[PDB]
Write a protein that binds this ligand. Structure first.
Ligand SMILES: *[C@@H]1O[C@H](CO)[C@@H](O[C@@H]2O[C@H](CO)[C@@H](O[C@@H]3O[C@H](CO)[C@@H](O)[C@H](O)[C@@H]3O)[C@H](O)[C@H]2NC(C)=O)[C@H](O)[C@H]1NC(C)=O
Ligand SMILES: *[C@@H]1O[C@H](CO)[C@@H](O[C@@H]2O[C@H](CO)[C@@H](O)[C@H](O)[C@H]2NC(C)=O)[C@H](O)[C@H]1NC(C)=O
Ligand SMILES: *[C@@H]1O[C@H](CO)[C@@H](O[C@@H]2O[C@H](CO)[C@@H](O)[C@H](O)[C@H]2NC(C)=O)[C@H](O)[C@H]1NC(C)=O
Ligand SMILES: *[C@@H]1O[C@H](CO)[C@@H](O[C@@H]2O[C@H](CO)[C@@H](O)[C@H](O)[C@H]2NC(C)=O)[C@H](O)[C@H]1NC(C)=O
Ligand SMILES: *[C@@H]1O[C@H](CO)[C@@H](O)[C@H](O)[C@H]1NC(C)=O
Ligand SMILES: *[C@@H]1O[C@H](CO)[C@@H](O)[C@H](O)[C@H]1NC(C)=O
Ligand SMILES: *[C@@H]1O[C@H](CO)[C@@H](O)[C@H](O)[C@H]1NC(C)=O
Ligand SMILES: *[C@@H]1O[C@H](CO)[C@@H](O)[C@H](O)[C@H]1NC(C)=O
Ligand SMILES: *[C@@H]1O[C@H](CO)[C@@H](O)[C@H](O)[C@H]1NC(C)=O
Ligand SMILES: *[C@@H]1O[C@H](CO)[C@@H](O)[C@H](O)[C@H]1NC(C)=O
Ligand SMILES: *[C@@H]1O[C@H](CO)[C@@H](O)[C@H](O)[C@H]1NC(C)=O
Ligand SMILES: *[C@@H]1O[C@H](CO)[C@@H](O)[C@H](O)[C@H]1NC(C)=O
Ligand SMILES: *[C@@H]1O[C@H](CO)[C@@H](O)[C@H](O)[C@H]1NC(C)=O
Ligand SMILES: *[C@@H]1O[C@H](CO)[C@@H](O)[C@H](O)[C@H]1NC(C)=O
Ligand SMILES: *[C@@H]1O[C@H](CO)[C@@H](O)[C@H](O)[C@H]1NC(C)=O
Ligand SMILES: *[C@@H]1O[C@H](CO)[C@@H](O)[C@H](O)[C@H]1NC(C)=O
Ligand SMILES: *[C@@H]1O[C@H](CO)[C@@H](O)[C@H](O)[C@H]1NC(C)=O
Ligand SMILES: *[C@@H]1O[C@H](CO)[C@@H](O)[C@H](O)[C@H]1NC(C)=O
Ligand SMILES: *[C@@H]1O[C@H](CO)[C@@H](O)[C@H](O)[C@H]1NC(C)=O
Ligand SMILES: *[C@@H]1O[C@H](CO)[C@@H](O)[C@H](O)[C@H]1NC(C)=O
Ligand SMILES: *[C@@H]1O[C@H](CO)[C@@H](O)[C@H](O)[C@H]1NC(C)=O
Ligand SMILES: *[C@@H]1O[C@H](CO)[C@@H](O)[C@H](O)[C@H]1NC(C)=O
Ligand SMILES: *[C@@H]1O[C@H](CO)[C@@H](O)[C@H](O)[C@H]1NC(C)=O
Ligand SMILES: *[C@@H]1O[C@H](CO)[C@@H](O)[C@H](O)[C@H]1NC(C)=O
Lengths: 426, 120, 118, 52
């Protein structure tokens, strides 16, 4: 009675992993809401996070190729103390280091004197030198081009023809499971590739409430990503009127360094309010209690030691990589100012062999910045769920980008299908 | 008027009215790989329709009868009470048998038409 | 020759459609150029396919001509105009015509689906 | 200098040279064993060979 009828253009899809376009090529966005659908999402199996990670690494590596190498500056340094007025907390933090640098001429050196942060130098004992640059015994140092900025620029990931991106609009979406309010887009919204290690800055806020996302909430080896519904503002500054000088080290190689600091030296601090931070932590704890016992005491603590790039909270305020100390922020059991250390020679992500030198920017650097999320890690159930301790632990950078790509899934369109009809060909 | 995949959650007998909306939306190294794979997927689907004798059509009727072992349902529940996604899931791993039957039926039809057109 | 009939009248240029055809299909820049030519060819072939004109160069349809698109008679259109001038004259309605053509095919297959269901 | 057989006489040489270090303005004295086929004689002062 019934016959096979072939249809082409069937609105069905399968989960798939394909290559996405990076648009910024400004797209004309479209969004089609899908009525009466349910789609299973899994933010921790989303290939878009791995592809975004690879794209950011490739763009970063490409940006540093046509730039000045600092190979001739891997020389011994004669470092002494800074003669300006400093406080007790900054004793030994900044050093005045002299060295012999090359010039455009191959057989004519030049004495130089430059201020360096203590974190950027390592002791090395010789008759006339005291320190060397931290990375010169591990890898070449490449100077970032001063014409190229670091500041995140929102980008869009776009599926190729034959593929589509599904967006989950459900409130209180925990990152996995079914989603009912699902729409189809060709390109994602503008996602800022913001680089941070403990707090998520300039990201997306939750529509309804604080959302706690974990691949396995009972596995203490996985990170917990907390998205806030309200932002908490961070005011960061390096209160030092830095005077930047430069020297020519090769035929086309110009090197930039700290020349001097005008006036007294004061430390580099980020201010977060106390009323809103206390409300934020109360909300986070209230949401945590829904994944643990209702009478379990939840306490926050300082991060563990080891690997300064992880133990501190990074930004890219101005053009200078801060590294703040959240120990005074999470020291509570359920304003505020954070001493931030400055480095210039940065090994970003967890790579070894590619060292980038961030040149200083003249003047003061002050930036205000929305905190939109947190990365928390649990210490472990050593008390049998009597008391739980959470720390602002670090993790791979994928966790920050996943915190934006959790709403998107890539699906492959399958235009063909078959179905019974009474239609017989002849 | 619903847009691309707008009918995806609608019933099969309603979503079948929007086949042109889906069809029109099917068309540096990474960008070329994405464009070439989209072209290859389109061309494989078009060649597969051509092998079945359905070239140039979006709704193509054939001479393969429906087996009750593939889906023991009536037309009302298939077309009016379920979506194409649920149907596609229901007949998963039965499509290769259907495709083979469609290929063989078209080969037999082409031979029969050639023999009919060979009569003086 | 290729585009030789571009300056001829449409009645004469319509007999050289196979001459204009075949010239549509035949280090990274050359590969991008080849992919772009293939993409444009396939977009045009899909656009013909959704109209029920697949495999044909002269395809008759069921969409009536609207006098608001052009009020010229067939003698003036086919004997006194080239394809370039005609294309310029009706460009502002081309997509509307395409939409109507698509709609006709959407009806036509359904009618055929019903006729074969008897 | 070792218990070298007749077949290996002149085939392996103990050579020393001034190599650079991770620091531009430092030098180190390094010695190594090279095969004769990797070395070409050179007439200079305080040296008598170079690498091919
Ligand atoms: C999070 O977003 C805020 C808001 O965009 C970022 O702060 C803004 O950053 C821009 C770009 O660096 C600043 O513009 C700069 O201003 C200085 C002023 O001297 C100028 O010299 C630079 O050339 C550039 O125009 C802007 O002032 C700043 N605005 C505010 C209100 O903070 C912030 O950097 C972002 N945070 C992260 C971690 O990406
Ligand atoms: C860093 O050290 C340099 C010397 O290597 C200092 O430069 C000298 O500063 C004194 C200040 O009284 C001057 O009188 C000298 O003429 C300077 N010499 C040169 C060669 O510039 C520099 O001031 C030091 N900077 C800081 C911040 O302590
Ligand atoms: C920078 O160059 C100067 C060149 O004068 C170095 O000073 C001399 O260094 C040699 C050894 O390299 C000593 O024997 C001389 O006595 C030094 N001269 C003086 C006046 O002190 C200086 O040491 C170099 N600095 C660094 C950090 O390498
Ligand atoms: C190659 O030559 C070097 C130096 O000419 C030798 O190194 C010395 O070896 C003697 C033993 O004969 C030691 O007492 C010295 O302390 C070594 N000096 C250094 C600087 O290492 C080396 O042993 C020779 N190797 C061979 C295989 O003959
Ligand atoms: C610099 O001064 C601090 C105390 O002000 C002292 O502890 C430190 O050793 C000094 N460093 C040098 C290189 O003189
Ligand atoms: C470079 O020096 C630092 C100084 O502590 C050391 O930890 C590191 O291991 C050195 N690199 C290598 C490759 O040995
Ligand atoms: C998200 O919520 C759904 C609701 O049923 C639940 O089944 C799923 O396990 C949750 N996932 C996570 C990661 O909390
Ligand atoms: C889906 O989310 C959007 C977000 O604004 C909302 O407007 C829409 O009503 C939601 N859909 C349903 C079915 O609730
Ligand atoms: C954020 O969530 C808290 C949860 O108590 C709620 O009180 C507050 O109004 C929410 N804010 C917004 C802007 O949704
Ligand atoms: C993963 O989640 C399940 C859910 O109950 C849990 O039983 C399991 O122990 C978790 N994995 C680990 C490694 O703890
Ligand atoms: C400092 O922080 C508060 C709250 O975070 C913010 O409202 C204010 O505008 C900031 N002020 C400055 C001068 O950065
Ligand atoms: C941070 O707080 C300190 C405390 O006095 C203040 O001096 C500084 O101006 C604040 N920073 C900003 C950017 O407002
Ligand atoms: C942050 O400050 C606390 C104050 O006790 C200190 O113990 C901790 O080591 C500091 N963080 C880092 C990364 O040094
Ligand atoms: C630093 O001091 C110099 C003195 O000439 C002044 O011109 C400059 O504006 C100052 N910069 C800041 C950021 O205060
Ligand atoms: C930060 O939060 C405030 C709160 O209203 C918002 O108006 C502002 O645009 C946010 N800034 C950024 C850079 O996201
Ligand atoms: C969703 O289901 C309701 C149930 O009757 C139906 O009326 C509606 O049309 C369906 N949505 C679509 C897009 O067809
Ligand atoms: C298809 O139908 C035939 C009889 O028409 C039956 O023997 C065969 O088993 C069916 N196919 C399957 C996969 O069961
Ligand atoms: C189709 O089968 C279902 C299965 O129970 C039945 O409920 C429905 O009434 C049937 N419809 C027709 C038209 O036979
Ligand atoms: C074939 O498809 C049906 C559809 O549900 C499924 O239940 C069955 O397991 C599939 N066969 C195999 C061997 O997986
Ligand atoms: C050009 O116009 C003249 C007018 O007489 C005509 O004879 C000639 O054939 C035309 N050219 C072509 C290529 O048709
Ligand atoms: C012809 O076009 C006009 C507007 O361009 C439209 O109003 C009219 O309905 C069209 N003709 C027919 C027969 O639909
Ligand atoms: C076509 O229209 C034109 C108007 O300029 C007229 O001169 C010509 O005679 C018409 N042709 C026919 C065959 O009616
Ligand atoms: C098409 O529209 C443009 C502006 O919309 C107008 O300038 C042009 O003349 C129109 N073309 C014709 C053939 O009328
Ligand atoms: C070193 O080896 C060469 C190889 O021919 C030989 O001629 C020479 O005499 C040897 N010298 C010594 C000191 O053994």
């Amino acid at each position: 009675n019934l016959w096979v009828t072939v249809y082409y253009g069937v609105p069905v899809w399968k989960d798939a992993e394909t290559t996405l376009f990076c648009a910024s090529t400004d797209p004309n966005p479209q969004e089609i809401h899908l009525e009466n659908v349910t789609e299973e999402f899994n933010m921790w199996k989303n290939n878009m996070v791995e592809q975004m990670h690879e794209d950011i690494i490739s763009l970063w590596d490409q940006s540093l190729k046509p730039c000045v190498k600092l190979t001739p500056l891997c020389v011994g340094l004669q470092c002494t103390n800074v003669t300006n007025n400093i406080t007790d907390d900054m004793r030994g933090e900044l050093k005045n280091c002299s060295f012999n640098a090359t010039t455009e001429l191959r057989n004519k050196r030049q004495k130089v004197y430059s201020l360096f942060y203590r974190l950027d130098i390592v002791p090395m004992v010789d008759l006339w030198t005291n320190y060397r640059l931290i990375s010169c015994n591990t890898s070449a140092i490449t100077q970032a081009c001063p014409k190229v900025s670091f500041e995140p620029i929102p980008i869009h990931y776009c599926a190729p023809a034959g593929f589509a991106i599904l967006k989950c609009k459900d409130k209180k979406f925990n990152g996995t499971g079914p989603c009912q309010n699902v729409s189809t887009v060709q390109c994602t919204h503008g996602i800022k590739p913001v680089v941070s290690t403990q707090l998520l800055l300039n990201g997306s806020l939750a529509e309804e409430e604080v959302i706690i996302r974990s691949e396995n909430i009972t596995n203490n080896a996985k990170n917990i990503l907390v998205q806030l519904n309200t932002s908490v503002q961070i005011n960061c500054t390096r209160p030092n009127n830095n005077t930047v000088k430069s020297i020519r080290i090769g035929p086309g190689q110009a090197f930039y360094y700290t020349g001097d600091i005008i006036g007294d030296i004061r430390q580099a601090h980020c201010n977060v309010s106390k009323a809103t931070w206390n409300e934020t932590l109360g909300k986070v704890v209230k949401q945590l209690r829904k994944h643990f016992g209702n009478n379990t005491i939840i306490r926050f603590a300082q991060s563990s030691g080891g690997d300064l790039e992880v133990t501190t909270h990074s930004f890219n305020c101005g053009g200078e990589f801060f590294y703040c100390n959240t120990s005074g922020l999470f020291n509570s059991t359920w304003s505020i100012t954070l001493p931030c250390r400055i480095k210039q020679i940065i090994n970003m992500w967890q790579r070894i062999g590619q060292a980038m030198y961030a040149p200083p920017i003249q003047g003061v650097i002050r930036c205000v910045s929305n905190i939109t999320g947190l990365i928390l890690t649990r210490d472990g159930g050593s008390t049998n769920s009597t008391t739980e301790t959470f720390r602002p632990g670090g993790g791979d950078m994928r966790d920050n980008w996943r915190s934006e790509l959790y709403k998107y899934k890539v699906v492959k369109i399958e235009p063909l299908g078959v179905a019974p009809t009474r239609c017989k060909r002849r | 008027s619903l847009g691309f995949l707008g009918a995806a959650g609608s019933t099969m007998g309603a979503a079948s009215m929007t086949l042109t909306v889906q069809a029109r939306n099917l068309l540096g190294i990474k960008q070329l790989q994405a464009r070439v794979l989209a072209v290859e997927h389109y061309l494989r689907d078009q060649q597969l329709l051509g092998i079945w004798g359905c070239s140039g059509k979006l709704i193509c009727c054939t001479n393969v009868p429906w087996n009750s072992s593939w889906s023991n349902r009536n037309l009302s529940e298939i077309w009016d009470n379920m979506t194409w996604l649920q149907w596609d899931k229901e007949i998963s791993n039965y499509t290769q048998i259907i495709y083979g039957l469609l290929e063989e039926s078209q080969n037999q039809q082409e031979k029969n038409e050639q023999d009919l057109l060979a009569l003086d």
